[model samples]
Target chain A: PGATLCLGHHAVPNGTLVKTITDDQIEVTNATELVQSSSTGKICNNPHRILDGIDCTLIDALLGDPHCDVFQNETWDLFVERSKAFSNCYPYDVPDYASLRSLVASSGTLEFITEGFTWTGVTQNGGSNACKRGPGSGFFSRLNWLTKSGSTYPVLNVTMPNNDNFDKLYIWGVHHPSTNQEQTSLYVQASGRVTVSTRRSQQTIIPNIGSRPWVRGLSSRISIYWTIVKPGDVLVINSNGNLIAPRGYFKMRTGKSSIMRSDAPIDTCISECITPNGSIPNDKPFQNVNKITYGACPKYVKQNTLKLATGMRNVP
Target chain B: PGATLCLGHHAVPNGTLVKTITDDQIEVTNATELVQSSSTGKICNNPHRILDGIDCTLIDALLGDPHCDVFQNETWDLFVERSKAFSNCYPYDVPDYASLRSLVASSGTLEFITEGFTWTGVTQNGGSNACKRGPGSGFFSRLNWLTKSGSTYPVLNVTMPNNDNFDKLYIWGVHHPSTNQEQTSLYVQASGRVTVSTRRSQQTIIPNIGSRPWVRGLSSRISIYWTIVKPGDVLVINSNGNLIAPRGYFKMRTGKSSIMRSDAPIDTCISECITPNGSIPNDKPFQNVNKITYGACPKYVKQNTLKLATGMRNVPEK
Candidate 1:
């Protein structure tokens, strides 16, 4: 089955901040404009000149901002937080921060954040005394000011819990800056759940039914709530503004706990099991196990719960 | 480079005959009807049957009648008569009648003549029994009867000259049969002429003009005439309505005759001099010289002459 996400109107309000990390080693924060320019002067007479100031300013802001580094510094914290609330939860392995940082810095990331700063005001700055006060000076100057003002809108950092579980995952925010002009703003947020299995053999699993919306306000605050159930249980948005209960379950077996496991391994477990039939082995062998159980199970379950728990838990 | 024939409307009039010998080895005359049939048992089922019968019968009579043998007998006779009358004219080599008879009889010679006959006659068989005639058995039947009346119609016999010095030729005849229904008797005094020449090389020769007409009436008879002056000359029906003249002069050569010359070593002058340019060398050293001499010339000259002749002869352009 394919992965699906639902977005409703006004569900994610204006100025909601969202961050996405792509497979290309690029990390994007709230409203991080993806700046691209060409030196050929084919499209614009001076693309480099046009982008010079904006690119420099944006890059400096991203590097200097402490909040943008959360994915690197607070990965473990987020993983633990997610395990407690979200069904079928797993932590994604973070690559070497230094390497990713360099990649992101060299070529600024493409951020599609829906929540961000927007243009609030325009003012005339320079002209003769009378001209400055007159409509010509004010009108032309204000027009230019409007474009610049729109570029440097205030950004809000929507704080989201490191770990939040829910049957359904929703990311939303709003951007209601105090500006008299008709300002338009956008915001986006994304979250995913990782799960582990406790069934001994072909156990039926079901995900949580109702969960709070993952909400983020223009003030940069994010909240996510979810429930845990079983492995191979799909988490979906239901009709009544909540996550639908998961359908299928998986089998589980006993194994040793001393083997070190990573979030990436656990993610591999969920990803491998949830893949199309005949894609990968459904049962995985834990470390130091004598008899065969579910061989080649998803790594997310082994890392998120097995590695942390003292003993195997039954399918919820 | 192309051969053109100026045929008068009178040459192809209503009730004229057109025959084609099919590849199936079936010799069918006026075959257009023989190939099509419909059930005659039901009423209104054969609406066009009457019309078809009329057309088929008329075509059959035209094609079957021996009087339609224009090229070999009438046209060839005219050519010989005119050539004999002209200067430096040589007697054409008349083929052995026995040889032709043998070939035609044995089916060995792939030679046959196709004649197109036209008739203008009264539909009624006689003035006394006019009312008894039915739709299917009127004018067409009369024509059929006329054709079957006797074998008095002319027979065609073409004789190529023994020498090939002159290119001009003619055909003539007198007291020919004419189709006139009302008059007590009718006759056609037919006469015509044709002139041919070689263009570029001797291989591209053509009949530049052919003016042959049939005049039929109790009071008067029809006279046909033609002449060619050069390779590019046109056979035009003159305004006087009596003679047809050449539009240009004939291109005469002084070298060896293709047939008689010692150097050429070619016995068939007509074939060698009239073969189309770039065509394969004909077997037996003789070409089927019909298209090159009569049909291949430019359309402007041909169409103009045909138009003029059609108007003068009181015949439709088609």
Candidate 2:
């Protein structure tokens, strides 16, 4: 009753007798130390301090089906080996595991703006009579510009008077909803000199056609599009001002004519104009198309031969 | 007790009344259903069956102080994102994470074989009188070939007779412990024709020298070592057969003379014959030197001018 015992530096208060020795020596026990001779016994002193230092959460995620008892039974040599392998194999600044988990959850959805604008408008003059009378007919009669909410340009299109060849003015601009006015981003003159205008000022995007006037190309076709550059947003006017509107004609207008400082409210829609063979039977008027979505533009779709194939007009 | 109801496909037995609605309609409750207003309520249905499919143990290891309620409250979208990120970030084809865990738990130590052999033996004949009466003198007198347990070719060294240039047979070989006899791995003849012998047969590693006989180069030095190749293990005899042994003279003998079909019992030690400048003061007699160890040879060390500097003889060409 008067005998005092200790386990290394730790004092064993009323220590339990672990075992009776053959040589008349008695073994004492402490709570902090591991019970010798047991595979799963709690280790004494937490020798490695593995429990205190290790990231249990990361280990749980990385290990497929780990035996938790490994910590209790493994020798110091083996424990050190495992610690080194873990550090070498994975090379990443894992600031937070949940952040990576969240990123994985957010990705993998098909929600993005189409690479090319949708063909929604067309205008023709001094051309075939068949072009004048059809289910989809008239100068710039087919116009439906729709885009995801908070786009750069919500509603943009082109306009030309029917059968008016002398004063051949191909005007392309954005339709302001509240102002109810057309803000001309650019226009094609009869002489084929393209002029781009913004609130800042006006600049000539293309020189006057030396071979022929812009009015002479009504028998063929015209294609136009715009590119939005961010960080002090500027819109550059592009068009096949004097060339044939061939297949993938939007891409053919690769040359940038001029840049205009423009404010694109998060509430804008994309724009596209129809081609010679294409028709928009159900033409939707240009308006705001805003909806919460995810993703960036993938690639532009080019229609080589426009057809009235199943619900093409309604696709928009 | 009179009221009966069901939650989806599961039948709710003796359903309890939840609340009285605005239109005098009584809301019924079931054990399987969640309370509508609670943020971390036990969901009415396991819509995703995430609990059934997920590896909880792995998730537990990976999540850093994670909120356990994430599985309960988070939408499937966020859950899927986390799952995908976990898959993409770590590129290893994790056949079993436990294997990886075990591997991680088992690496990192400085237990390896040395890059160069220890210069434990030295012998000189027809040389200065002082060479015969130093702290380390005699034919192959300073020999201390110590190796880890289970080494391949545990004992190897070189021997040459004193003042006898006539039959200047510089014999070098491995000492077979059981036979207690020198099993010649190779030897340099007086004519400079190096011959490497094994149980298979004897092969001439280098032809006779045209310039001078092999016995004439005793005024200079000679360096020697061996290389062990695995998978049908072959021991190749290498030496500066007829050249001036310069600094890094062991590496200068880059040309392999011949290969011998040698059965290396993973229980052999490495060998190295020192240069003229290097001295073996504390020459330990050669015997079995095998010990268990890990790692491969890194690179050969070079001793330019041998010095009796700070127990240099004790170093394996330090």
Candidate 3:
């Protein structure tokens, strides 16, 4: 059996609020045996080397915190509100890893770390713009599920990769702790000789899935997070569990790159799960988890990247 | 007062053997000044996951050596031949950082190390495919000459970005000790977890001109190489020393990402120097001195990836 870190905290519509599991929601299963998994999946490993990864810890805080269960449930905008809290510590144009470390090294105890702010009508560079809660105890606790193919029932329980690693941990508020990049951590030089601070912040613990969207705008289907974990750590999901992994669904955005720079950057990683009526899973890969099946590319630029590779940029 | 590592080693046609410096084609300069320059300049920073910065080191080594000077005062292909050595270590794939780290840790020492080798022959799994020559000694020497806007006088001597940081070191053959990838100079994992080998054999010290072309066939215009370095490490040159405090020139390839990758991928960062077209005033930016001016995107494809990016299916600009 593996030890659980944080649980139940979900994304709040704004900083003054938070969310969590419902009375009718699914339950978590704590199994005794452990299964080993690898990070080699259709996920975004480390993209910009800096920004992309910095998001993980904050993302970790956004979901599964049993403590936040008293709060209401809400679907916050990814860029407008959710990601706003992350910029609190890093306010400069360029990301200085050393400075980034300082922000995360919160001995100053902004205790209500994840307790105060939000981005309802706030703009970029504006004050009162993010989830300014000083980090107090952030932990993730949520139920997770999976399946192999077809029907929702006959739902299977296999020792698959810890795909729900992020869903299982606590919803660390914007700059949440508990699951701090699982902590490998980054800085400077001496003389003309600059001392480069080499801290490789890595979270090896959980997840078969990563939110690797092909383009920027396409929000992640299953909200995800990460932590440093061990091989033998295990989870025994129930077979009748409802969380189903989608295999053949995806949104294909063709030529969206030329439309604007913000939406231009492409990633090409596929989605982890989807809904039964064929829409992005409203909320999934977590407690009230669904069954499983793999899927196609999840966004425009990326799916197009795939199409172009196949010499077919046509929107199919 | 600077130190020299493997002074001679160069690439032989085989990559299994190595070669180097012929004693006095040029003399090393000893200027006791250190200009604190930062890696900050008009350059591309880490694009993907921060690992591309690591690949440039091995890319820095894939070019020339003092040994090649004797082979000929030749201008080798850039886009093709030189960069090809890099692939032997990486194979036909993306620069997935961790795997790139393992390729730079060669133990096969053909001994002649930086003495001989080229892309025309040799494969990665093959024994001699690395910077093997125990950088017993390292020094890069280049014959410097220049022409500005067109004239040679007022021939500017001003300090510029020691950009040669990567453009000025020797490519001694296989974990080739002589060039040493200038040596902090490996992998195994348990479980499904892939064990990442982490020592990025860095050749710290030295300068100017390395072709580092891919193994296929293109050639280099202004050769370059590199090694690890310090800030404030300075080199002053030119007898009339007129082009003095510094002598430099730069080529902005504009959209041509293939001439080379960003972060320079150069080990030959030489101190810029000047003189008449045929002279040896080839002063450089750091140790084992040499000359010259300066020097990608694709979310991930590559300009070499242009073909792949275009789904064109031609040999990559690699």
lDDT of each: 0.20, 0.21, 0.21
Q: Give me the runs in candidate 2 sitting further than 4 Å from their true place.
A: A1-218, A224-232, A238-316, B1-24, B27-318
Worst 10 residues of 3 chain B by lDDT: B186-195
lDDT of 3 by residue, A244-266 (tens): 11111111122211100011122
For each candidate in turn, the TM-score is 0.11, 0.13, 0.20
Instruction: Return the lDDT, model 3, position A22.
Output: 42
How far residue A252's Cα lies from its native spot in candidate 2, in Å, is 27
Query: TM-score for model 2?
Result: 0.13
**Candidate 1 regions with alpha-carbon error over 4 angstroms:** A1-70, A73-295, A298-316, B1-318
Candidate 2, A1-316: lDDT as tens digits:
5997875444434543332235232334331222111111122222111121132222222211122212321222001112212321111123344543232222211111112333232221212222332443322212122222222222222211122211111223221111111112122222122223221112223322222222312312222322222223222222322211111111111211111111121112221211111111113222112211111211222322112212111111
Best by lDDT: 2
Better of 1 and 3 by TM-score: 3
The full ranking of all candidates by lDDT, starting with the best, is: 2, 3, 1
TM-score of chain A of each: 0.14, 0.17, 0.16
Candidate 1, A188-260: lDDT as tens digits:
1121111111111011112122223332212211112222233333222211111111212111122221111
Using DockQ as the measure, which candidate wins? 3
| Most TM-score-accurate candidate | 3
